[PDB]
């Protein structure tokens, strides 16, 4: 069954450096 | 700009930052990371974008954007 996009957005939200050339 | 590129190689534990020309073979980079790890080059695989980086290829033809992460893992039988 399909769910609503908003009730899903609601439920969801609630030191080196080496150098080579 | 077009000149070079900067890359990170992280083995999950440590990191190293690298500058290379977009056209340079990654072989060196990979070796540089391996020795600085004290590992055998062939004892680890370098992943990028899910592919298994090959020593022959360069960042350019790999579609590498500045500050991309390269993942080094032990050569084993998948995670």
């Amino acid at each position: 069954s399909q769910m609503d996009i908003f009730s899903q957005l609601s439920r969801a939200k609630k030191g080196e450096i080496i150098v080579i050339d | 700009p077009e000149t070079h590129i900067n890359l990170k190689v992280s083995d999950g534990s440590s990191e190293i930052f690298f500058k290379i020309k977009k056209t340079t073979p990654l072989r060196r980079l990979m070796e540089a990371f391996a020795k600085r790890q004290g590992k055998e080059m062939d004892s680890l695989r370098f992943l990028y974008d899910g592919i298994r980086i090959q020593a022959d290829q360069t960042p350019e033809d790999l579609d590498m954007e500045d500050n991309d992460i390269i993942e080094a893992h032990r050569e084993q039988i998948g995670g």
Partner: protein, 255 residues
């Protein structure tokens, strides 16, 4: 106030047309640096988000954020009484209740201008922080389209499943199953035909195929598609356009 000038009224019509395959209403959020067209499908499951950057326009000006809630029928009606080659200009003041489209034939000094009453639309509520994503793949958009057209024939739903080295699309009809398994790969001969996978969490979702069938029409606009799925979050499909970004947010179905 708001003054957005498309060089060709057809550019605007193309946008309006795209949208008319999925939605009836669009909200045009006009910000200082471009417009963000936003719509939600009638069954409240699909969310489309188009970002017309500023260089898309011939001349842009927005002194203050306005929201222009439009009916795609009305809008299409007005677009008929205009020539695809005319410049088009949207004109609104700082707190609109009505908009003005202004067609302009430059080579004749014709000027045509029609009003349009705005309305209230709930796709004003697209305040997604984009969230964050278990997995993220990208692939040639037509390749993705091919897959979708095939398995949508088998069933009313398609299942995507990501693993450290596997994207697997599947559909099961009571007339036949079928399934595609693709694997991240690169080639120097044709870099843009590449499959990129960034996994952090194995994902397994299912989507209504009809929506996926809309979503795939984006491929005309962009030769690659990015897909970002996460366990219980709407999936992101998105296409890079030269002067912007097309984005779909699709809710998976629960079991």
């Amino acid at each position: 106030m708001l003054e957005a000038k498309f060089e060709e009224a057809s550019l605007f019509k193309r946008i309006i047309d795209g949208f008319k395959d999925c939605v009836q209403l669009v909200n045009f959020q006009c910000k200082e640096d471009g417009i963000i067209a936003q719509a939600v499908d009638d069954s409240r499951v699909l969310l489309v988000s188009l970002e017309i950057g500023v260089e898309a326009f011939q001349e842009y000006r927005c002194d203050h954020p306005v929201t222009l809630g439009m009916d795609l029928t009305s809008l299409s009606k007005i677009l008929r009484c205009g020539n695809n080659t005319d410049t088009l200009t949207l004109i609104a003041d700082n707190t609109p209740d009505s908009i003005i489209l202004l067609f302009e034939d430059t080579k004749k000094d014709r000027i045509a201008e029609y009003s349009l009453k705005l309305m209230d639309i709930d796709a004003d509520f697209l305040g997604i922080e984009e969230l964050q994503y278990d997995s993220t793949l990208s692939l040639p958009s037509s390749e993705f389209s091919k897959i979708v057209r095939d398995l949508s024939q088998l069933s009313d739903s398609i299942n995507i499943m990501i693993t450290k080295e596997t994207i697997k699309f599947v559909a099961d009809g009571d007339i036949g199953s079928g399934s595609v398994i693709i694997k991240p790969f690169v080639d120097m001969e044709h870099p843009e035909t590449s499959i990129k996978l960034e996994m952090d969490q194995p994902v397994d979702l299912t989507f209504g195929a009809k929506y996926l069938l809309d979503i795939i029409k984006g491929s005309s606009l962009s030769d690659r598609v990015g897909i970002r799925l996460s366990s219980e979050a709407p999936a992101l499909f998105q296409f890079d356009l030269k002067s912007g970004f097309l984005q779909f947010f699709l809710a998976p179905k629960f079991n």
